[PDB]
């Protein structure tokens, strides 16, 4: 199995114990660590943060004592400008300048591959996305062709049925990608105005949600049916929760809300919490395992958060092993309890170690 784990470069700026640099990462935890994100500037791949070159080095030094560890650089992101990617991918000359810029940059900076994070191609970009992936892989084969270790090409793909149908030619891109990470979280399965879990494993109660699509199992089965080989499909597991402010005394799934949850102290983003912030939240909270969805929510006062814990990520690993998938993907290492100081067990990376342990289990 693969355990593909993201590190985000803006996590260095979080206050106090929230600050995360690559030298806090456990070199033996994951098989692949992906650094997010690189820019595209003047149609060339390029750095984003002022100190990316320093942080690239802190990450790649982890391979010194773990020669099996691979690193990739993820280009794009969700505040990149899909308009910007679209223009780069449709223009024949821009696309070639970008492809040609990628292997020198990865070799210069010590990376083993590129992860494409175009979030998200439009219906009008579906074929451009295929062409981009085909031509990028072709350049990687050419660059290695004299006995080099070939660079890896991965892509992070939406788990949302509407985006999958509009944006991706799954069967074609799967032939060229070394692996696909399906982003099986941030689902919006609840009726408008109500709570729901953003990463359920299955639909659960049939008469309680609008659609059958907003869950991990539907997305995985669908992408396999569309032609992604199981041996290339890496299943996303979040180390963050999505939260809501409750509008009444009701606290179950589908309870009325007035808006997103109160921001966490470190991540400062209403509607989201890192897992270590959730560990803090859990003191005084009530935890419920959602029947049929195989994941917990916690509620306290007027707050409600749907998240994954050690038990639920082991169930998700059992699921992916039953489906013979390639492994698990984790967003993100800096949202796990990487310090080991919040989740009361003294253990660093509690959620990602739980995933690692389940993948290794027999
Ligand atoms: C990422 O690259 C883009 C594209 O070059 C940069 O966007 C430019 O930024 C300058 C400085 O703010 C602006 O004056 C230009 O108008 C922008 N150009 C475009 C096409 O948007 C962006 O600054 C880069 N981001 C980084 C390095 O963090
Ligand atoms: C607007 C949504 C965006 N979503 C991202 C999750 C991560 N995902 C990727 C992207 C790639 Cl390339 C690869 C894997 N996953 C892209 C979407 C969450 C961000 C988040 C914010 C705050 C906190 Cl505390 C935790 C997570 C919640 O918000």
Q: What's the CA angle centered on 321, arms 111 and 173, to 5 degrees? A: 50
CA of 94 to the centre of ligand 1 (A): 16
In order of 71, 107, 140, 194, the CA distances from 146 in angstroms are 21, 15, 11, 57
| CA nearest neighbour of 74 among 48, 43, 93, 50 | 48
Residue 70, both tokens: 């691979």
Angle of CA points 331, 102, 70, to nearest 5°: 45
* Centroid of ligand 1 to alpha carbon of 69 (angstroms): 33
Beta-carbon contacts of residue 80 (< 8 Å; ≥ 6 apart): 37, 39, 117, 118, 119
Atom 22 of ligand 1, nearest CA residue: 41
Phi, psi of 188 (to 5 degrees): -115, 70
The ligand placed nearest to the CA atom of residue 76 is: 2
The whole-angstrom separation of Cα 261 and Cα 305 is 8
Residue ranges around ligand 1 (CB below 6 Å) = 39, 41-42, 48
Q: Which of 78, 82, 262 to mutate to test the pocket of ligand 2 (most atoms within 8 A of CB)?
A: 78
Work out which ligand 2 atom sits closest to the CA atom of 274. Answer: 24
Resolution in A: 1.5
**Which class for 126: exposed (0-12), middle (13-18), buried (19 or more C-beta within 10 A)?**
middle
Residues with a CB atom less than 6 Å from ligand 2: 6, 74, 78, 117, 156, 181, 183, 186, 240, 267, 269, 272-274, 331, 335
Q: Which atom from ligand 1 is nearest to the alpha carbon of 40?
A: 2
Residues annotated as binding site? 49-50, 76-79, 120, 183-186, 242, 331
| Nearest-10 Cα torsion for 39, 41, 46, 50 | -80
Residues recorded for the chain: 362
* Nearest-angstrom CA–CA distance, 62 and 106: 16
Burial grade of 180 (CB within 10 A; 0-12, 13-18, 19 or more): buried
Which has the closest alpha carbon to 36: 64, 68, 9? 9
42 CA from centroid of ligand 1 (Å): 9
- Give the residues across from 257 on adjacent strands: 246
Which residue's CA is the nearest one to ligand 2's atom 2?
Answer: 186
- Neighbouring residues of 275: CB distance < 8 A, sequence distance ≥ 6: 239, 240, 241, 307, 308, 335, 336, 337, 343, 350, 351
- In order of start, what are the domains of the chain with their CATH numbers? 2-238+308-360 (3.20.20.80)
A 10 A CB-CB count for 219 gives 24
Structure tokens at 134: 């085909």
Query: Can you read off the two tokens belonging to residue 187?
Result: 């689902």
SS3 per residue for the chain: CEEEEEEEHHHHHCCHHHCCCHHHCCCCCCCEEEEEEEEEECCEEECCCCCHHHHHHHHHHHHCCCCCCEEEEEEEECCCCHHHHHHHHHCHHHHHHHHHHHHHHHHHHCCCEEEEEECCCCHHHHHHHHHHHHHHHHHHHHHHCCCCCCCEEEEEEECCHHHHHHHCCHHHHHHHCCEEEEECCCCCCCCCCECCCCCCCCCCCHHHCCCCCCCHHHHHHHHHHCCCCHHHEEEEEECEEEEEEECCCCCCCCCEEEEECCCCCCCCCCCEEEHHHHHHHCCCCEEEEECCCCEEEEEECCEEEECCCHHHHHHHHHHHHHCCCCEEEEECCCCCCCCCCCCCCCCCCHHHHHHHHHHHCC
The closest-lying atom of ligand 1 relative to the alpha carbon of residue 49 is 28
Q: Which of 8, 9, 38, 41 to mutate to test the pocket of ligand 1 (most atoms within 8 A of CB)?
A: 41
**In terms of DSSP bridges, do strands 32-41 and 44-46 run parallel, antiparallel, or are they unpaired?**
antiparallel
**Which residue puts its alpha carbon closest to atom 16 of ligand 2?**
78
Those residues whose C-beta lies under 8 Å from the C-beta of residue 186, and which sit 6 or more positions away, are: 198, 199, 238, 242
The residue nearest atom 7 of ligand 2, judged by CA position, is 331
Q: What is the rounded CA–CA span in Å between residue 216 and residue 291?
A: 15
Instruction: List the determination method.
Output: X-ray
Ligand 1: centre distance to CA 47 (Å): 11
- Which atom of ligand 2 approaches the CA of 115 most closely? 12
The residue behind tokens 């810029």 is 101
For residues 317 and 360, the answer to whether their CB atoms sit within 8 Å is: no
Query: Of all atoms in ligand 1, which is nearest to the CA of residue 47?
Result: 27
Please answer whether residues 183 and 170 qualify as being in contact, where contact means their C-beta atoms are separated by less than 8 angstroms.
no
Residue written as tokens 């780069």? 88
How far, in Å, is the centroid of ligand 1 from the Cα of 79?
A: 12
Binding site residue list for chitin:
49-50, 76-79, 120, 183-186, 242, 331
């Amino acid at each position: 199995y693969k355990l593909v784990c993201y590190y985000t470069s803006w996590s260095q700026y979080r206050e106090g114990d929230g600050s995360c640099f690559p030298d806090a990462l456990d070199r033996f935890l994951c098989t692949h660590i992906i650094y997010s994100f690189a820019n595209i500037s003047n149609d060339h791949i390029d750095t984003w943060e002022w100190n990316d070159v320093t942080l690239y080095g802190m990450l790649n030094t982890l391979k010194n004592r773990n020669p099996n560890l691979k690193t990739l650089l993820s280009v794009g992101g969700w505040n990149f400008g899909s308009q910007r990617f679209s223009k780069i991918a449709s223009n024949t000359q821009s696309r070639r300048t970008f492809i040609k810029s990628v292997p020198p940059f990865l070799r210069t900076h010590g990376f083993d591959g590129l992860d494409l994070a175009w979030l998200y191609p439009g219906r009008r970009d579906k074929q451009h996305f295929t062409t981009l992936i085909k031509e990028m892989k072709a350049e990687f084969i050419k660059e290695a062709q004299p006995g080099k270790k070939q660079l890896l090409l991965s892509a992070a793909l939406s788990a949302g049925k509407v985006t999958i149908d509009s944006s991706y030619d799954i069967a074609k891109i799967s032939q060229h990608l070394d692996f696909i990470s399906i982003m099986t979280y941030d689902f919006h399965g609840a009726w408008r105005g109500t709570t729901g879990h953003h990463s359920p494993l299955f639909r659960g109660q049939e008469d309680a949600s609008p659609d059958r699509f907003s869950n991990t199992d539907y997305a995985v089965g669908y992408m396999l049916r569309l032609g992604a080989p199981a041996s290339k499909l890496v299943m996303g597991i979040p180390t963050f929760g999505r939260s809501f402010t409750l509008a009444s005394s009701e606290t179950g799934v589908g309870a009325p809300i007035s808006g997103p949850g109160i921001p966490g102290r470190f991540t400062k983003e209403a509607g989201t919490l890192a897992y270590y912030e959730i560990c803090d939240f859990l003191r005084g909270a009530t935890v419920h395992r959602i029947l049929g969805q195989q994941v917990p929510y916690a509620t306290k006062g007027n707050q409600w958060v749907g998240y994954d814990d050690q038990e639920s990520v082991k169930s998700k690993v059992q699921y992916l092993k039953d489906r013979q998938l390639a492994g698990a993907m984790v967003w993100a290492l800096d949202l796990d309890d990487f310090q080991g100081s919040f989740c009361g067990q003294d253990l660093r990376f509690p959620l990602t170690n739980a995933i690692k342990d389940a993948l290794a289990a027999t």
